[PDB]
Amino acid sequence: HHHHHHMVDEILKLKKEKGYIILAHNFQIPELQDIADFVGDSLQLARKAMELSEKKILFLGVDFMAELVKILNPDKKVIVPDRSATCPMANRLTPEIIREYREKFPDAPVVLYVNSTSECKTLADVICTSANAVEVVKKLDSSVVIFGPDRNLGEYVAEKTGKKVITIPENGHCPVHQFNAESIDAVRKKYPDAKVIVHPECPKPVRDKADYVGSTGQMEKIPERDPSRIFVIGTEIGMIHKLKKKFPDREFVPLEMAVCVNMKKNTLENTLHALQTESFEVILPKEVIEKAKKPILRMFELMG
Ligand code: SF4
Numbered sequence: 227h228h229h230h231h232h233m234v235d236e237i238l239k240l241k242k243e244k245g246y247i248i249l250a251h252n253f254q255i256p257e258l259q260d261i262a263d264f265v266g267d268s269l270q271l272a273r274k275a276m277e278l279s280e281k282k283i284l285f286l287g288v289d290f291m292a293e294l295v296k297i298l299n300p301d302k303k304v305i306v307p308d309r310s311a312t313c314p315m316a317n318r319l320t321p322e323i324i325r326e327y328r329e330k331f332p333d334a335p336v337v338l339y340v341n342s343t344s345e346c347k348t349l350a351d352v353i354c355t356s357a358n359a360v361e362v363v364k365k366l367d368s369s370v371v372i373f374g375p376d377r378n379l380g381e382y383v384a385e386k387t388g389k390k391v392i393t394i395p396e397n398g399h400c401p402v403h404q405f406n407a408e409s410i411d412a413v414r415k416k417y418p419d420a421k422v423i424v425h426p427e428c429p430k431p432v433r434d435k436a437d438y439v440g441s442t443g444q445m446e447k448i449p450e451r452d453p454s455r456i457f458v459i460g461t462e463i464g465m466i467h468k469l470k471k472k473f474p475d476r477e478f479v480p481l482e483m484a485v486c487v488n489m490k491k492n493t494l495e496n497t498l499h500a501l502q503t504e505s506f507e508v509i510l511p512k513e514v515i516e517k518a519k520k521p522i523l524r525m526f527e528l529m530g
């Protein structure tokens with residue numbers, strides 16, 4: 227409209243004027259995706275974090291990813307519009323729990339999903355995202371691993387690798403991706419030639435009835451090789467916008483409406499304000515950056 231127009235225009239002028247690059251996750255609102263310089267999944271954001279040139283980064287997503295960007299760029303400025311933008315699943319794994327399980331299952335490497343606190347990362351042998359979890363866990367020599375905080379992704383990794391995956395905490399899961407399998411049954415009836423794509427954070431019954439299971443970055447690539455007219459999408463609602471923009475020739479139907487309240491905390495208004503004030507800076511203890519970069523870089527080493 228007219229008010230969003232002023233905010234958009236200023237964001238683009240200020241970003242240019244101040245030497246910011248704006249990076250956004252796929253679950254950000256459409257209006258912020260549209261103003262970002264790079265929108266992608268966690269893995270793509272991590273790779274982008276290593277190769278960008280700008281000295282200042284405005285990050286639009288949740289805290290753990292902003293902090294990852296910072297860990298890989300300790301001498302650049304990283305700001306976020308809202309510091310409370312967090313991943314509730316991630317926050318239930320603690321350093322005390324990792325220590326507990328390391329003592330309970332000595333020998334086993336600790337693999338942490340990128341949705342994890344930066345302090346938890348310092349204790350990990352290696353980090354993974356949904357895109358590379360299976361690959362990463364295969365290259366570890368141990369046949370037993372400790373994995374968290376997502377039980378669903380861990381269980382997915384166990385199925386694919388055949389390795390024993392001890393998940394922590396007890397019931398770590400993403401509430402956004404708790405779709406009902408009956409939704410897939412229903413959509414099969416309504417659109418019998420649609421392809422169903424879901425995230426590995428979804429529960430097993432949902433995963434098992436999908437045509438494709440993958441990270442949101444992987445989702446965005448499936449239509450490059452699958453000619454299907456209709457795709458049904460089991461991830462957070464913001465992905466629909468991204469998909470529709472990439473492939474205007476196809477139809478994208480949410481499996482169900484699912485919203486990450488934390489991802490929606492960034493708005494045009496607080497994004498503009500962030501560029502105006504150059505705040506809030508992402509700041510981490512030096513020790514945490516030193517100790518956490520290890521398993522993050524290990525992830526890229528075990529990849530290809
Ligand atoms: S969608 Fe789920 S896993 Fe991703 S940030 Fe939100 S609560 Fe965390």
Ligand SMILES: [Cl-]
Nearest residue numbers: 437438451452
């Ligand atoms: Cl395939």
